[PDB]
Each structure stands twice: as structure tokens, then as C-alpha cells.
PDB file of C-alpha atoms in Angstrom:
ATOM      1  CA  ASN A   1     -88.954  84.303 229.743  1.00 40.83           C
ATOM      2  CA  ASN A   2     -87.847  80.965 228.293  1.00 41.05           C
ATOM      3  CA  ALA A   3     -91.223  79.257 228.738  1.00 40.20           C
ATOM      4  CA  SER A   4     -93.014  82.264 227.271  1.00 39.71           C
ATOM      5  CA  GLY A   5     -91.027  81.774 224.050  1.00 38.34           C
ATOM      6  CA  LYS A   6     -91.461  78.001 224.003  1.00 37.12           C
ATOM      7  CA  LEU A   7     -95.203  78.642 224.214  1.00 40.15           C
ATOM      8  CA  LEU A   8     -95.173  80.855 221.090  1.00 37.85           C
ATOM      9  CA  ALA A   9     -93.019  78.325 219.230  1.00 34.17           C
ATOM     10  CA  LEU A  10     -95.538  75.598 220.084  1.00 35.99           C
ATOM     11  CA  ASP A  11     -98.574  77.663 219.072  1.00 38.80           C
ATOM     12  CA  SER A  12     -97.275  78.560 215.603  1.00 41.53           C
ATOM     13  CA  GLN A  13     -96.263  74.958 214.817  1.00 38.53           C
ATOM     14  CA  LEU A  14     -99.707  73.848 215.991  1.00 38.65           C
ATOM     15  CA  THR A  15    -101.526  76.209 213.622  1.00 38.45           C
ATOM     16  CA  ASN A  16     -99.353  75.167 210.668  1.00 37.98           C
ATOM     17  CA  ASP A  17     -99.507  71.398 211.209  1.00 38.25           C
ATOM     18  CA  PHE A  18    -103.289  71.506 211.580  1.00 35.56           C
ATOM     19  CA  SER A  19    -103.626  72.941 208.068  1.00 32.29           C
ATOM     20  CA  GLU A  20    -101.223  70.350 206.681  1.00 32.21           C
ATOM     21  CA  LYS A  21    -103.301  67.549 208.227  1.00 34.88           C
ATOM     22  CA  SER A  22    -106.455  69.164 206.834  1.00 33.75           C
ATOM     23  CA  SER A  23    -104.972  68.989 203.326  1.00 31.20           C
ATOM     24  CA  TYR A  24    -103.667  65.427 203.872  1.00 27.01           C
ATOM     25  CA  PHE A  25    -107.270  64.414 204.634  1.00 29.77           C
ATOM     26  CA  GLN A  26    -108.636  65.673 201.311  1.00 31.69           C
ATOM     27  CA  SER A  27    -105.789  64.144 199.336  1.00 30.79           C
ATOM     28  CA  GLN A  28    -106.438  60.802 201.051  1.00 28.44           C
ATOM     29  CA  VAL A  29    -110.226  60.686 200.507  1.00 29.04           C
ATOM     30  CA  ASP A  30    -109.673  60.915 196.736  1.00 28.59           C
ATOM     31  CA  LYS A  31    -107.199  58.030 196.919  1.00 31.09           C
ATOM     32  CA  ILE A  32    -109.809  55.866 198.678  1.00 31.82           C
ATOM     33  CA  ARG A  33    -112.372  56.744 195.991  1.00 29.73           C
ATOM     34  CA  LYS A  34    -109.860  56.038 193.194  1.00 30.76           C
ATOM     35  CA  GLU A  35    -108.993  52.600 194.584  1.00 29.86           C
ATOM     36  CA  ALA A  36    -112.621  51.624 195.229  1.00 30.42           C
ATOM     37  CA  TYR A  37    -114.181  52.729 191.954  1.00 31.57           C
ATOM     38  CA  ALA A  38    -111.220  51.456 189.951  1.00 34.23           C
ATOM     39  CA  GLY A  39    -111.412  48.027 191.568  1.00 35.34           C
ATOM     40  CA  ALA A  40    -115.182  47.845 191.158  1.00 35.42           C
ATOM     41  CA  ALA A  41    -114.799  48.098 187.366  1.00 33.81           C
ATOM     42  CA  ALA A  42    -113.102  44.671 187.344  1.00 33.17           C
ATOM     43  CA  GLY A  43    -116.488  43.020 187.828  1.00 33.66           C
ATOM     44  CA  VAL A  44    -116.747  42.436 184.086  1.00 32.05           C
ATOM     45  CA  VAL A  45    -115.312  38.923 184.376  1.00 33.00           C
ATOM     46  CA  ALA A  46    -118.976  38.072 184.972  1.00 33.70           C
ATOM     47  CA  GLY A  47    -121.915  39.757 183.257  1.00 32.94           C
ATOM     48  CA  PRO A  48    -123.635  43.026 184.204  1.00 32.60           C
ATOM     49  CA  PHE A  49    -124.838  41.189 187.321  1.00 30.50           C
ATOM     50  CA  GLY A  50    -121.170  41.102 188.323  1.00 28.88           C
ATOM     51  CA  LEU A  51    -120.918  44.811 187.483  1.00 28.54           C
ATOM     52  CA  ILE A  52    -123.848  46.005 189.590  1.00 25.84           C
ATOM     53  CA  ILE A  53    -122.833  43.696 192.445  1.00 28.33           C
ATOM     54  CA  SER A  54    -119.425  45.406 192.460  1.00 27.21           C
TER      55      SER A  54
ATOM     56  CA  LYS B   1    -113.789  17.741 184.364  1.00 27.59           C
ATOM     57  CA  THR B   2    -115.801  20.454 186.118  1.00 27.97           C
ATOM     58  CA  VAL B   3    -113.085  20.810 188.774  1.00 30.37           C
ATOM     59  CA  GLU B   4    -110.372  21.361 186.155  1.00 27.95           C
ATOM     60  CA  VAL B   5    -112.272  24.035 184.243  1.00 25.88           C
ATOM     61  CA  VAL B   6    -113.083  25.802 187.534  1.00 22.96           C
ATOM     62  CA  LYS B   7    -109.375  25.648 188.467  1.00 23.09           C
ATOM     63  CA  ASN B   8    -108.356  27.070 185.084  1.00 24.26           C
ATOM     64  CA  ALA B   9    -110.999  29.806 185.382  1.00 24.66           C
ATOM     65  CA  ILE B  10    -109.612  30.772 188.810  1.00 25.10           C
ATOM     66  CA  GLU B  11    -106.042  30.957 187.469  1.00 27.97           C
ATOM     67  CA  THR B  12    -107.212  32.980 184.447  1.00 25.85           C
ATOM     68  CA  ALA B  13    -109.132  35.427 186.656  1.00 25.20           C
ATOM     69  CA  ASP B  14    -106.061  35.931 188.856  1.00 26.01           C
ATOM     70  CA  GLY B  15    -103.909  36.673 185.800  1.00 29.35           C
ATOM     71  CA  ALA B  16    -106.512  39.058 184.367  1.00 30.76           C
ATOM     72  CA  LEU B  17    -106.751  40.925 187.675  1.00 33.54           C
ATOM     73  CA  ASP B  18    -102.962  41.358 187.824  1.00 33.63           C
ATOM     74  CA  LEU B  19    -102.856  42.591 184.212  1.00 29.73           C
ATOM     75  CA  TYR B  20    -105.711  45.040 184.867  1.00 32.36           C
ATOM     76  CA  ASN B  21    -103.972  46.547 187.902  1.00 33.17           C
ATOM     77  CA  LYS B  22    -100.670  46.747 185.998  1.00 31.63           C
ATOM     78  CA  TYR B  23    -102.208  48.658 183.089  1.00 32.54           C
ATOM     79  CA  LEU B  24    -104.288  50.879 185.368  1.00 34.43           C
ATOM     80  CA  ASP B  25    -101.226  51.966 187.357  1.00 36.72           C
ATOM     81  CA  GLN B  26     -99.718  53.228 184.078  1.00 38.51           C
TER      82      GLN B  26
ATOM     83  CA  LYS C   1    -110.796   7.993 191.796  1.00 39.58           C
ATOM     84  CA  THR C   2    -112.801   9.522 194.646  1.00 39.52           C
ATOM     85  CA  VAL C   3    -109.581  10.504 196.441  1.00 41.22           C
ATOM     86  CA  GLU C   4    -108.251  12.351 193.384  1.00 43.05           C
ATOM     87  CA  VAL C   5    -111.415  14.363 192.789  1.00 43.48           C
ATOM     88  CA  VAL C   6    -111.534  15.262 196.502  1.00 45.79           C
ATOM     89  CA  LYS C   7    -107.876  16.363 196.294  1.00 45.45           C
ATOM     90  CA  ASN C   8    -108.579  18.489 193.214  1.00 48.23           C
ATOM     91  CA  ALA C   9    -111.656  19.996 194.894  1.00 49.63           C
ATOM     92  CA  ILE C  10    -109.534  20.949 197.926  1.00 51.90           C
ATOM     93  CA  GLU C  11    -106.889  22.608 195.727  1.00 50.19           C
ATOM     94  CA  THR C  12    -109.593  24.434 193.738  1.00 46.73           C
ATOM     95  CA  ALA C  13    -111.278  25.692 196.922  1.00 46.95           C
ATOM     96  CA  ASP C  14    -107.946  27.001 198.229  1.00 48.48           C
ATOM     97  CA  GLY C  15    -107.324  28.874 194.970  1.00 51.61           C
ATOM     98  CA  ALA C  16    -110.857  30.297 194.946  1.00 52.46           C
ATOM     99  CA  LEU C  17    -110.493  31.497 198.540  1.00 55.59           C
ATOM    100  CA  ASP C  18    -107.213  33.272 197.724  1.00 55.20           C
ATOM    101  CA  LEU C  19    -108.750  34.916 194.640  1.00 57.90           C
ATOM    102  CA  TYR C  20    -111.803  36.033 196.641  1.00 57.67           C
ATOM    103  CA  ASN C  21    -109.669  37.666 199.341  1.00 58.55           C
ATOM    104  CA  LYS C  22    -107.462  39.314 196.698  1.00 56.75           C
ATOM    105  CA  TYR C  23    -110.419  40.887 194.889  1.00 58.62           C
ATOM    106  CA  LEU C  24    -112.152  41.868 198.129  1.00 60.58           C
ATOM    107  CA  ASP C  25    -109.080  43.737 199.383  1.00 59.25           C
ATOM    108  CA  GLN C  26    -109.266  45.881 196.224  1.00 56.34           C
TER     109      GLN C  26
END
């Protein structure tokens, strides 16, 4: 009876933490894109060659 | 004289990169 | 005078390498 309640407590925490990781993923992809395309705009210390190469 | 203007350009580019990141974080 | 321009070239190359790694990490 104790293990059959521990098993339910594990299953519900599993289904909640999977959705929180699935939202963490999408919030983290946008941070990678922000950092990359914001750092690539600093290739104006050279000409447009330095812009396309960034 | 080429080495000194390349050294000053490197220091200027480092300062410009820091200022760009500082303004962009705001 | 050769020793001083080699010393300045070494210091300039060190600064350029640091600036390259700093921009590439961004």
C-alpha cells in the first residue's frame, strides 16, 4: 500500500516536470537566437563584407 | 607605424564591442 | 630597432587574438 502511493506520487511529478522542461526548451531557443543575431550585427566595424560574413 | 595603428584599432574595437553590448542589454 | 618592432608585433598579435576570441564567443 505504501509503494502503490509512491508510484502515483512519482507519476504525477513526472507528467508535470516534462511540461516544464518542454517550455524551458522554447524559452531557451529564443535566447540562443537573440544572442546570435544580436552579436552578428556588430560586424559593421568593417564594411558590408563584414556584415555578410557575420 | 603600422603596428601602432593596428594596436589602436584593436583597442578601439574592443571598447566599441563593450559599449554595444552595454547599450543592447538596456 | 628590430627587437622593438618584434616586441610590438607580439603584443599586437596577443591583443588581436583576445579580441577575436571575444567576438567569436558572441
